[PDB]
Amino acid sequence: TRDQNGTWEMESNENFEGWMKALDIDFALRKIAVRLTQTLVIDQDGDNFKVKCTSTFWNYDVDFTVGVEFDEYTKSLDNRHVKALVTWEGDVLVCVQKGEKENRGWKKWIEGDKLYLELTCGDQVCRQVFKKK
Numbered sequence: 001t002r003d004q005n006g007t008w009e010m011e012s013n014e015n016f017e018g019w020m021k022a023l024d025i026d027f028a029l030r031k032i033a034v035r036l037t038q039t040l041v042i043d044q045d046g047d048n049f050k051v052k053c054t055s056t057f058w059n060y061d062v063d064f065t066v067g068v069e070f071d072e073y074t075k076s077l078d079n080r081h082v083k084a085l086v087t088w089e090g091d092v093l094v095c096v097q098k099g100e101k102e103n104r105g106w107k108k109w110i111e112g113d114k115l116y117l118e119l120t121c122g123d124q125v126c127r128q129v130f131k132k133k
């Protein structure tokens with residue numbers, strides 16, 4: 001399944017600090033972020049996605065179209081410009097964000113009732129798992 005639409009609750013977060021540190025997020029914000037429960041809400045309609053991440057203190061939202069490059073400003077995350085592209089490799093949704101950081105992007109896939117999210121930046125890999133609400 002390519003179907004990622006739904007509300008998803010984080011169950012596992014490995015190397016969450018290493019990835020944020022790779023992006024140079026402020027130590028004070030990382031210290032609090034590592035404690036927070038996260039929810040992902042995904043609306044998928046053909047190529048068009050709307051992804052909302054939420055936690056008590058900070059959110060992150062991004063819209064994109066699969067297969068269409070977009071010049072992204074990463075906003076309150078790390079205030080950088082990247083050239084983002086999201087495509088499918090089999091049933092894995094793959095985002096590459098070309099820019100200052102090497103190996104920057106993510107991969108999103110479903111295994112049964114679970115959504116797996118691998119976030120990358122430099123030499124760091126953060127692996128997350130969510131269960132569908």
Ligand SMILES: *C/C=C(C)/C=C/C=C(C)/C=C/C1=C(C)CCCC1(C)C
Pocket residue numbers: 020033036038051053054055058059060077106108117
């Ligand atoms: C496709 C799903 C993606 C790309 C999920 C992205 C989620 C984030 C970039 C999360 C950012 C957050 C922090 C770095 C600090 C705490 C609050 C979060 C979870 C919104």
